[PDB]
Ligand binder design. Structure first.
Ligand SMILES: Nc1nc2c([nH]c(=O)n2[C@H]2C[C@H](O)[C@@H](COP(=O)(O)OP(=O)(O)OP(=O)(O)O)O2)c(=O)[nH]1
Ligand SMILES: [Mn+2]
Ligand SMILES: [Mn+2]
Ligand SMILES: [Mn+2]
Length: 156
């Protein structure tokens, strides 16, 4: 049994493009990703996701929808990362670079998988198909998956 810490991840997914951010420092630096971070005390997971989206991309959204949950384990780290994944298609301002992230739109036939976390190759296609999912990935360092599970689910 391991303890887990709550994180969020938000994908702004439109009909033909997705907004990603290049992580400029910290965890996962150098990889394109959705926006997110730790959930803080007192806020719902969805509201923490909205907050991180605003902080890292400048975008303010009224609502998100849950699309998946992914648990990450790292060799040498006792704490699991419990990542709650959300989407929205509906925005009304422009993305702006933050200290954490440089936002960029990608067409949906140009998803930059080689410059994303390796696990994203497995679950991101489900997100694109509008399937909901649960995943688990064990990493050695940043690059190497030692074990993983991925399951489509009816409810996140
Ligand atoms: N796509 C993808 N995202 C991941 C993976 N692992 C992982 O932690 N994430 C996400 C969850 C969070 O959005 C982010 C990690 O949190 P973070 O370090 O940005 O937290 P934060 O913004 O609060 O950190 P900080 O500003 O205090 O430095 O990366 C992964 O394998 N794939
Ligand atoms: Mn953040
Ligand atoms: Mn972050
Ligand atoms: Mn934060």
């Amino acid at each position: 049994m391991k303890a887990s810490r709550l994180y969020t991840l938000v994908l702004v997914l439109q009909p033909q493009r997705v907004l990603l951010g290049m992580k400029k420092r910290g965890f996962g630096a150098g990889r394109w990703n959705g926006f997110g971070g730790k959930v803080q005390e007192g806020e719902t997971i969805e509201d923490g996701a909205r907050r991180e989206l605003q902080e890292e991309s400048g975008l303010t959204v009224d609502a998100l929808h849950k699309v998946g949950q992914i648990v990450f384990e790292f060799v040498g780290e006792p704490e699991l990362m419990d990542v709650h994944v959300f989407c929205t298609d509906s925005i009304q301002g422009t993305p702006v670079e933050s200290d954490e992230m440089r936002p960029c739109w990608f067409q949906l036939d140009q998803i930059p998988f080689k410059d994303m976390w390796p696990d994203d190759s497995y679950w991101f296609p489900l997100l694109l198909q509008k399937k909901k999912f649960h995943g688990y990935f064990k990493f050695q360092g940043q690059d190497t998956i030692l074990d993983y599970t991925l399951r489509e689910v009816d409810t996140v």
